Structure formats: C-alpha cells, structure tokens
Amino acid sequence: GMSNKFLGTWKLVSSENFDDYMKALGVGLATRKLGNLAKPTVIISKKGDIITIRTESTFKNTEISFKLGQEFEETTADNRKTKSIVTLQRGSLNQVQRWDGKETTIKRKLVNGKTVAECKMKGVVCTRIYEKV
C-alpha cells in the first residue's frame, strides 16, 4: 500500500537537530562528528511485497528489507541491533526500532515531492529533508 512516490533515490538536503538525536541514541562524540558531516543517499525500492531502504554514505552504509507490519532484525548505522517494524499510517512510512528496552521512531512522509524524515528519541525530534534525484 506504500505510495510509489516513495520509490527512488533521495539525497539529504537538510538536517535539523541530528546531533541531539544521535546523542540521545548514545552515539559518541567522534561518531557524531562524522554523522553530522555525512550527506547520505537513501534508495527505496520494492520487489513484490518486500521493500528495501538502503542508505549510502562515505562513513556508513545500511540496508533493510521488510514487509509492512512484520518485525525484522535490523543493524543501524551506529551498530545498534534492533527489532524493527515499518508501517503505513496516513501515507507516512513509520519505522520503529526497539533495543535494550529503548525505542526510536523514524517517520518518512512526502511533502511537496520531498521526503521528510522525522526522527524521535526520548522527546528529541530531528528533521531531515531529502530531495529526489
């Protein structure tokens, strides 16, 4: 049920409050330094019911494949091992990651042709805007 408008190759154009988001995930200073400098490309694709989100950067690459509503094991860019679930709520693609009794959410939604990712951890909100390419 995912909008095919999500599908494509997307480039970060802006990021707000990423440091405090990373810090709340427990990312350490040197890694945050490089994370803040990174300008990743996110590639969303679909094969049958299986959706893939691939993030590419000089510093770290990541890739998850999933079916909506089906928990799956994830390795995040900061090397957290999580149980994740991705869902559709109101045209938004909502990812939840759980590990060690913690939880963070990344909500990706289409806004005037951009993908806007809202990343929440413990009341810290970070917003990152992606342009299709």
Ligand X SMILES: CCCCCCCCCCCCCCCC(=O)O
Q: Tell which positions 104-123 bind ligand X, by CB under 6 A.
A: 106, 117, 119
- Out of 2, 38, 68, 96, point to the residue binding ligand X (CB under 6 A): 38
Cβ 105 vs Cβ 120: under 8 Å = yes
Nearest to 76 by CA among 87, 61, 88, 66: 61
8 or 48, CB closer to ligand X? 8
Per partner kind, with CB cut-offs from 5 to 8 A, the member of Cl ion, Mg ion, ligand X, none near residue 19 is: Mg ion
Q: Which helix (H) or strand (E) holds 35?
A: helix 29-37
Work out whether strand 72-75 and strand 41-47 pair parallel, antiparallel, or are unpaired: unpaired
In whole angstroms, the minimum distance from the beta carbon of 128 to ligand X comes to 4
- Amino acid sitting at position 19: D
Q: Would you say 129 is a known binding-site residue?
A: yes
- Out of 59, 75, 83, 105, point to the residue binding ligand X (CB under 6 A): 59
Give the residue ranges of the annotated binding site for hexadecanoate: 108, 128-130
